[PDB]
Amino acid sequence: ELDQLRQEAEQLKNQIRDARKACADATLSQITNNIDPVGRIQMRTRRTLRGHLAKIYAMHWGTDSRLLVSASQDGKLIIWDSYTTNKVHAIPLRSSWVMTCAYAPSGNYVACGGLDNICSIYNLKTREGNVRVSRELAGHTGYLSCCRFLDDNQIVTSSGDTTCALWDIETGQQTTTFTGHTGDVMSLSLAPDTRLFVSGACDASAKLWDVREGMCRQTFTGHESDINAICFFPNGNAFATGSDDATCRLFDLRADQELMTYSHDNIICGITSVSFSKSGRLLLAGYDDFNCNVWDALKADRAGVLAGHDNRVSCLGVTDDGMAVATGSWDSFLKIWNG
Amino acid sequence: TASIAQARKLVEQLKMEANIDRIKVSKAAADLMAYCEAHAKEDPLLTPVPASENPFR
Amino acid sequence: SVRILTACFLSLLILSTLLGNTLVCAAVIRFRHLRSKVTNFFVISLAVSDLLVAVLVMPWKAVAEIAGFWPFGSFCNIWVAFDIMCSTASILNLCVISVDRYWAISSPFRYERKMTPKAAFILISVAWTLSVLISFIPVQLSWHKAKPNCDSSLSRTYAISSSVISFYIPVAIMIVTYTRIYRIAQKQIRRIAALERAAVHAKNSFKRETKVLKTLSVIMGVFVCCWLPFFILNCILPFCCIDSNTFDVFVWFGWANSSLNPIIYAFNADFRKAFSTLLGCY
Amino acid sequence: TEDQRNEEKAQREANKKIEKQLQKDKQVYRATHRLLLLGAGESGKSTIVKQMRISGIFETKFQVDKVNFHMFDVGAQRDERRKWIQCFNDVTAIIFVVASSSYNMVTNRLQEALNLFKSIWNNRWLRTISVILFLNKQDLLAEKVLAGKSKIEDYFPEFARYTTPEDATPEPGEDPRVTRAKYFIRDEFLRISTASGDGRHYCYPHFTCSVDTENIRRVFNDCRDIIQRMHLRQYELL
Numbered sequence: 001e002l003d004q005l006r007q008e009a010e011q012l013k014n015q016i017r018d019a020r021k022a023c024a025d026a027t028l029s030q031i032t033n034n035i036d037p038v039g040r041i042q043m044r045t046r047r048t049l050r051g052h053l054a055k056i057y058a059m060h061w062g063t064d065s066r067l068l069v070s071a072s073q074d075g076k077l078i079i080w081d082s083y084t085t086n087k088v089h090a091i092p093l094r095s096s097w098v099m100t101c102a103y104a105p106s107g108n109y110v111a112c113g114g115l116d117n118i119c120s121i122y123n124l125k126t127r128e129g130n131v132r133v134s135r136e137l138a139g140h141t142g143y144l145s146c147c148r149f150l151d152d153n154q155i156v157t158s159s160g161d162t163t164c165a166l167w168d169i170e171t172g173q174q175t176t177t178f179t180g181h182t183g184d185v186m187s188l189s190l191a192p193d194t195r196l197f198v199s200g201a202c203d204a205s206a207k208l209w210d211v212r213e214g215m216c217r218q219t220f221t222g223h224e225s226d227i228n229a230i231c232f233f234p235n236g237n238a239f240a241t242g243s244d245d246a247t248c249r250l251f252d253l254r255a256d257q258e259l260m261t262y263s264h265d266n267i268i269c270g271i272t273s274v275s276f277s278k279s280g281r282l283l284l285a286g287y288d289d290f291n292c293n294v295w296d297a298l299k300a301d302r303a304g305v306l307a308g309h310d311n312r313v314s315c316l317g318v319t320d321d322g323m324a325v326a327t328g329s330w331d332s333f334l335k336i337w338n339g
Numbered sequence: 340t341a342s343i344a345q346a347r348k349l350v351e352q353l354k355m356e357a358n359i360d361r362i363k364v365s366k367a368a369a370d371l372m373a374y375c376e377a378h379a380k381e382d383p384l385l386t387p388v389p390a391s392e393n394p395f396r
Numbered sequence: 397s398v399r400i401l402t403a404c405f406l407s408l409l410i411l412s413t414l415l416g417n418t419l420v421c422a423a424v425i426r427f428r429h430l431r432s433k434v435t436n437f438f439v440i441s442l443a444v445s446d447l448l449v450a451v452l453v454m455p456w457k458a459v460a461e462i463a464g465f466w467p468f469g470s471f472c473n474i475w476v477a478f479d480i481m482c483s484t485a486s487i488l489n490l491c492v493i494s495v496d497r498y499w500a501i502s503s504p505f506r507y508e509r510k511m512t513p514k515a516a517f518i519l520i521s522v523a524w525t526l527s528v529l530i531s532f533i534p535v536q537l538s539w540h541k542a543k544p545n546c547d548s549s550l551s552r553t554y555a556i557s558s559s560v561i562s563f564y565i566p567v568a569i570m571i572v573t574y575t576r577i578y579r580i581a582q583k584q585i586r587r588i589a590a591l592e593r594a595a596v597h598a599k600n601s602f603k604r605e606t607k608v609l610k611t612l613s614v615i616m617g618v619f620v621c622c623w624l625p626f627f628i629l630n631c632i633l634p635f636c637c638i639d640s641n642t643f644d645v646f647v648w649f650g651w652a653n654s655s656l657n658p659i660i661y662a663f664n665a666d667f668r669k670a671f672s673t674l675l676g677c678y
Numbered sequence: 679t680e681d682q683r684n685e686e687k688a689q690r691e692a693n694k695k696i697e698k699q700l701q702k703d704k705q706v707y708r709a710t711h712r713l714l715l716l717g718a719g720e721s722g723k724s725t726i727v728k729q730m731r732i733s734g735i736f737e738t739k740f741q742v743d744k745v746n747f748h749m750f751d752v753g754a755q756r757d758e759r760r761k762w763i764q765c766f767n768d769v770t771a772i773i774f775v776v777a778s779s780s781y782n783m784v785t786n787r788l789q790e791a792l793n794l795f796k797s798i799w800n801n802r803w804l805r806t807i808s809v810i811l812f813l814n815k816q817d818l819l820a821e822k823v824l825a826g827k828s829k830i831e832d833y834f835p836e837f838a839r840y841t842t843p844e845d846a847t848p849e850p851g852e853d854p855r856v857t858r859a860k861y862f863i864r865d866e867f868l869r870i871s872t873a874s875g876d877g878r879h880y881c882y883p884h885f886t887c888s889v890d891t892e893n894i895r896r897v898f899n900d901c902r903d904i905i906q907r908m909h910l911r912q913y914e915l916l
C-alpha cells in the first residue's frame with residue numbers, strides 16, 4: 001500500500017532525473033565561450049525620489065515607462081512621475097503591512113496586499129478624480145507576497161498558505177486555484193503572452209503553471225534555501241531565480257533543467273530581487289548587502305555594481321523600453337539608474 | 340484515510356510531469372544566444388545611448 | 397633652539413584643532429543620517445565654535461609668542477573680542493549638549509514630542525547671542541579695561557561679570573545634569589544585575605558600573621582641568637602677583653579644550669564610521 | 679510651448695498639495711510605538727486585546743499619557759518557520775503572553791511556549807527587540823497548585839530542588855506554595871532570556887491576569903524603560 005506508492009514515486013523521480021541527465025549534452029558556458037564579453041557597465045543615479053517614511057517593500061513600473069508605484073510599510077502607496085520627479089498620487093492604506101503592489105497594464109488600476117491576507121484594487125482614472133478602493137479579494141489564508149495583473153479584470157496572487165490563485169475582479173471570486181507547493185510562495189512572474197507563469201516557494205522549488213488549464217506542468221529544483229525572487233527571460237522560454245543561499249540560476253523550460261549559476265566567493269547575503277534587460281543580456285539582482293550586482297546572463301561575469309542605498313535593497317524594476325532601472329530600499333529611497 | 344489520497348495525488352502529478360518531450364540542452368542554449376544577438380541594438384542599458392534622446396538627462 | 401620647539405608644538409596644536417573640527421564638519425555634510433537627529437544639531441555648533449577658535453584666535457597669539465611682541469597693532473582690540481566670543485560659545489555649546497542629553501535620558505517620551513528641530517535652533521541662537529553680547533558690545537566700548545603690545549588688564553567688574561556668565565553658571569548646570577544622569581544610569585544597572593542574579597540562582601556588573609564613571613569622568617575632568625586654572629586667575633589678577641608667562645600658559649591650556657572636543661563628543665559608532673569612510677573608504 | 683507650461687504648473691501644484699499632506703503623516707508616524715503581540719490561542723491573549731480596546735492581521739490603537747501605541751496580532755492562520763517575522767524588526771517591544779497554568783495540560787503546552795520563546799529570542803531579525811513577558815492566568819495556576827492532582831515535579835523534574843529567590847515580593851494572602859511555582863516558571867523563562875542575552879535587548883517578566891486594568895500601564899512603563907536604556911546605551915553609559 002504505502003510501500004507500493006513510495007516505490008512508484010521513487011521510480012518516477014528516477015525516470016525524470018535519468019531523462020534530464022540524458023538530455024544534458026553541453027553546458028551554456030561551453031556554447032557561450034567565443035562571444036565577445038560586454039566589458040564594464042557604468043550606471044549613475046539619474047533621479048532620487050523621497051517622500052516615504054518607512055522601509056520600501058515593492059515598486060512596479062507602468063507600461064509607458066514614465067509612471068511607477070511604490071509601497072512602504074507606513075500605509076502609503078505613492079505614484080511617481082519618473083521624468084519630472086513629481087508625485088501624482090498618494091494613496092493611504094487600511095493595513096500598514098503591505099508587501100506587494102502592481103500596476104495595471106492599462107494604467108487605470110493599482111493593486112496592493114500584505115499581512116492582512118487581502119488584495120486591494122484601486123481605481124486610478126475615474127470621473128470623480130479621487131482614488132478609491134474598487135474591490136477587495138479575500139480567500140487566502142496566508143499573507144499576500146506577490147500579485148500581477150493580466151488585464152483590467154484578471155489578477156494572479158501568491159500567498160504564504162502554499163497556494164496561488166487566479167481572480168476575477170468584476171465578481172470578486174476565485175477562478176482557479178494552483179496547489180502543489182509545500183512551502184510559502186514568495187514570488188510570481190507572468191509570461192510575455194500571459195499564458196503561463198512561474199512561482200518560487202520556500203521549499204526551494206519553482207513551478208510552471210498553466211493559467212487556462214490550472215495544472216502544474218514542470219517543476220524545477222536546484223536551490224538549497226528559500227526562493228525570494230523570480231523573473232522571466234524576455235524570450236519567454238527561460239526564467240531566473242534568486243534565493244537566500246546567495247546564488248542565482250537560469251532554467252530553460254524546453255530543456256527542463258538549469259543552465260547557468262550566478263555566484264561569487266565574496267557574496268554570502270541572499271538575493272531579494274532579480275530582473276533582466278530588454279535584450280536579456282544583463283541580469284540585475286538585488287542583495288541584502290545594500291547594493292545591486294549587474295551580471296552577464298550568458299557568461300556569469302559581473303559586469304558592474306549599483307551602489308548608493310543606505311539599507312537593504314528590497315525591490316528592483318526595469319522599464320518596458322529598457323531606458324532605466326529603478327531600485328527601492330529599506331532606507332526609504334527610490335533611485336533611478338541609467339547608463 | 341488522507342495519506343493514501345495524498346500519495347496517489349503525488350503519484351498522479353509525477354506521472355504527468357514525466358510524459359513531456361525534452362529537447363537537447365545544446366539547442367536550448369543556442370536559442371538564447373540567437374535572441375540576444377538580434378536585439379543587442381535596442382538595449383539602452385547595454386549599448387549606451389547619447390543624452391540627446393535620453394529622457395533622464 | 398627652544399623657540400623652534402615651541403613653534404612646532406603650537407603649530408601642531410593649531411593643525412590638530414583644525415583637522416579634527418573640519419573632519420567633524422565634513423562628515424555631517426556628506427552623510428544625511430547624521431544631520432537627521434536633532435541631538436547632532438548641537439555637536440556641529442560646537443565644531444563651528446572650535447573652528448572659529450582655531451582660525452581667528454590661536455594663530456595670532458602663537459605668532460606673538462614666537463616673535464615676542466604684537467605685530468598687528470590695531471588688531472589687539474578686535475582679537476580680544478573674538479577670543480571672548482569664540483570661547484564663550486564653546487562653553488555654552490557644551491552646556492546645551494549636557495542639557496539635551498539629560499532631557500533625552502530622563503524624559504524619553506516628552507523629548508520625542510517637544511524637541512522639534514525648531515527648538516534646537518532657538519537654543520543655539522540663544523547661546524551664540526549670549527556669546528556676542530558680552531564680547532563685542534563691552535569691548536568696543538572700553539568697558540573691559542580698567543579705567544586706571546597686547547597685554548591689557550581687565551577691569552575688576554568686567555572680569556568677575558564675564559567669568560560668571562561664561563564659566564560658573566555653565567559649569568554648575570553641567571554638574572547638576574551629569575549627576576542626575578549618573579543616578580539614572582546606576583538604577584538601570586542594578587535592575588539588570590538583579591535579573592541576572594535571579595537567573596544564576598535558578599541555575600543553582602562591575603564593568604558596567606566602571607564604564608559609566610569612566611565616561612562621565614572623561615567628559616567633566618577634561619573641561620575642568622582645561623578651563624579652571626584660567627578662570628581662577630582671570631578673577632584674582634584684577635584684584636592683584638603672578639607674571640604674564642604663567643597666565644599665557646593657562647590661556648593656552650584653555651584653548652586646547654577645542655582640540656579634544658571632536659574626540660569627546662563626536663566619536664560614537666556612526667561619526668567614527670563616517671570618519672573612516674572619508675579617510676580611505678574604510 | 680504654452681501647453682507644456684500649463685501641464686508643468688498643474689503637476690507642480692498637485693505635487694505640492696501631496697507633499698503638504700505627507701508632512702503631517704510624518705509627524706504622526708514619529709509619535710507612535712509599534713508593538714508585536716505573540717502567544718498562543720490557549721493563552722489569555724484575546725482577552726488582553728479586548729481590555730486594551732475597551733481574517734488577516736489584527737491591529738489596535740490605544741493611547742496613554744498622550745503617547746500613541748499600535749499593536750498587532752499575528753494569530754491569522756499561521757504555522758512555524760515564520761517568514762513574515764522580518765516585517766517587525768523595528769518595533770519597540772514584543773508582547774509575549776503565556777498561560778502559566780497550562781503546565782499539566784498536554785508535549786506540554788508550557789514546554790511549547792518555552793521553545794517558542796527560545797526561537798523568538800535568538801531570531802536574527804530580533805537581535806535589538808526587547809520582549810515584555812506576561813505570565814498570564816495566575817489565579818488558575820494558584821487554584822491548581824492549592825488543591826488538585828497536578829504535581830509540577832511529575833512534568834518538570836527540576837522543581838523538586840527549586841528554592842524561592844530572595845527577591846520575591848509575594849502577595850500577603852498567597853500560599854507560599856503558590857509563589858514557588860510562579861518564580862520557578864519565571865526563572866525558567868529567564869534562563870533562556872539571559873543564556874544568550876546580547877545587551878541590546880532585555881526581558882520584562884510580569885505576573886498578570888487576563889482581566890486587569892494594569893496591563894496597559896505595564897506596557898507603557900516597560901516601553902519607557904526600553905527607550906531610556908536605548909538612550910543610555912547610545913551615549914556609551916550602558
Ligand SMILES: Cc1cc(-c2cccn3ccnc23)ccc1-c1c(C)c(=O)[nH]c(=O)n1C
Pocket residue numbers: 476479480483484546547548549550558559562630647
Ligand atoms: C585676560 C583675557 C581674558 C579674556 C576672557 C575674559 C572673559 C571670558 N573669557 C573667555 C575666554 N577668554 C576670556 C580674553 C582675553 C584676555 C587677554 C589675553 C589672553 C591676552 O593675552 N591679552 C589681553 O590683553 N587679554 C585681554
